[PDB]
Ligand binder design. Structure first.
Ligand SMILES: O=C(O)Cc1ccoc1
Length: 316
């Protein structure tokens, strides 16, 4: 089984989940790639070669037709804006892509939407970028300063060219440790950290018109948080789990956001005593959400961090 970790990446094709990176109480080996079979519940470790990225926490990854794409993260010498690809369809080779155009600023803890040939990245925490959007310094980083951004960048996989769309509507504030989910042409984003708050707002970017929309669901809504997961489980539902509140409470609540009804529904599950923050979540083809890793308590107290290697399965 893989070692415990937080800030790792996990991506899937609905059957196999590929886990990489992260750190524990030390970064996990850069050349290792763990594969979890969602049907049998078994793990397999493989060592990769090629342009192996440095070991990082907070990288942003996606799996499209079993091609893994990785952007950003934080390694032993800070944030990066490098882009890597790993074709998981023989020893697997990582490929660092020298992209065309102006890339995003070096950052981690951001989100991505997949839409046709585009990988659309949003937000994050990193160095000052010049770029369309706004960047807000984190005053605590001055005493290389860093901050939050609300930037939207497109990486066109047809030519590996970076660009920025011109967006309309009220964008969400700059943020990092938010969660992104794509359904149809809507790039949803929920919560995240900004200034002294871990927020409770829900928005979607229309990936055809580049219009931002804020969603105000009716009734009870989940508490604001960062370091939570948000996973599409059907053409009409997003599954929310875990995170960390403004007042530093680890979370074990789970909810479904019904897109058509614009309504949250609290989901009952047997993991109430297993809160997680900075875990990953991947949907399987059988409707389940597979949660891996993350921390059970406040990971900011590094000497007491309860990093996990547990698989938590939600039958959504
Ligand atoms: O504190 C958090 O929730 C994580 C974070 C730190 C800076 O930006 C996001």
């Amino acid at each position: 089984c893989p070692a415990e970790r937080s800030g790792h990446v996990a991506v899937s094709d609905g059957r196999h989940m590929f886990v990489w990176g992260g750190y524990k109480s030390f970064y996990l080996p850069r050349e290792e790639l763990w594969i979890y079979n969602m049907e049998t519940g078994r793990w397999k470790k493989i060592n990769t070669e090629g342009d192996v990225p440095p070991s990082m926490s907070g990288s942003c990854a996606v799996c499209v037709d079993r091609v893994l794409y990785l952007f950003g993260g934080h390694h032993s010498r800070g944030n990066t804006n490098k882009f890597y690809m790993l074709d998981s369809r023989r020893v697997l080779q990582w490929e660092r892509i020298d992209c065309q155009g102006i890339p995003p600023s070096s950052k981690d803890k951001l989100g991505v939407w997949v839409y046709k040939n585009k990988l659309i990245f949003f937000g994050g925490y990193g160095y000052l970028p010049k770029v369309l959007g706004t960047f807000e310094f984190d005053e605590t980083s001055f005493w290389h300063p860093r901050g939050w951004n609300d930037h939207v960048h497109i990486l066109d996989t047809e030519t590996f060219t970076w660009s920025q769309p011109i967006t309309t509507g009220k964008a969400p504030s700059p943020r990092a440790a938010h969660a992104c989910a794509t359904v149809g042409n809507r790039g949803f984003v929920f919560g995240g950290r900004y200034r002294d708050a871990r927020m409770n707002d829900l928005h979607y970017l229309n990936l055809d018109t580049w219009e931002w929309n804020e969603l105000i669901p009716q009734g009870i809504c989940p508490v604001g948080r960062s370091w939570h997961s948000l996973t599409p489980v059907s053409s009409d539902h997003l599954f929310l789990f875990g995170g960390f509140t403004t007042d530093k409470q680890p979370l074990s609540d789970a909810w479904t956001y019904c897109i058509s009804k614009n309504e949250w529904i609290q989901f009952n599950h047997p993991y109430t005593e297993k809160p997680r923050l900075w875990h990953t979540a991947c949907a399987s083809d059988e409707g389940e959400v597979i949660v891996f890793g993350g921390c059970a308590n406040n990971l900011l107290v590094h000497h007491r961090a309860a990093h996990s290697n547990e698989i938590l399965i939600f039958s959504v």
